[PDB]
Design a protein around this nucleic acid. Structure first.
Ligand SMILES: *CCCC(=O)c1cccnc1
Length: 108
DNA sequence: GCCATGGCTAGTA
DNA sequence: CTACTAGCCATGG
């Protein structure tokens, strides 16, 4: 599997998340058959044009939260996009935007 | 090669 | 609950 391949598969996968459902770096990395690739699942998302028509927002972390970004908190997008999707999120005690994984969670 | 860097994760404590 | 740890692994200097 070339990376250019990984990347698309992932994309396809991530594109199979329904409105208002989410999934998780890890899972999608499993789903496409690369269980050790959660990081790289992220790298894929990070690597997308803002114009993209791909539900990049529907992919948080297995700890049930939205991942912090050393590409600065512009990810606040994620929260919002999710809020529009219809997703109850709350702040913790470092805001760590958080949602009920079991509730909102994709399961083919 | 080394090293440092990430939208990660599972296991401890 | 949080707060560290291994491990993980492509990527870019
Ligand atoms: C992985 C998605 C990042 C991205 O393209 C984006 C961030 C903020 C606003 N629009 C797009």
């Amino acid at each position: 599997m070339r990376m250019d391949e990984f990347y698309t598969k992932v994309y396809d996968a991530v594109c199979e998340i329904p409105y208002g459902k989410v999934s998780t770096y890890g899972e999608i990395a499993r789903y496409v058959g690369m269980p050790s690739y959660a990081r790289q699942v992220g790298q894929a998302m990070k690597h997308l044009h803002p114009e993209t028509h791909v539900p990049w927002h529907r992919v948080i972390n297995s700890r049930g939260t939205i991942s912090k970004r050393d590409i600065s908190a512009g990810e606040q997008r994620q929260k919002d996009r999710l809020e529009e999707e219809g997703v109850e999120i709350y702040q913790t005690s470092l805001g760590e935007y958080k949602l009920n994984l079991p509730e909102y969670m994709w399961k083919p």
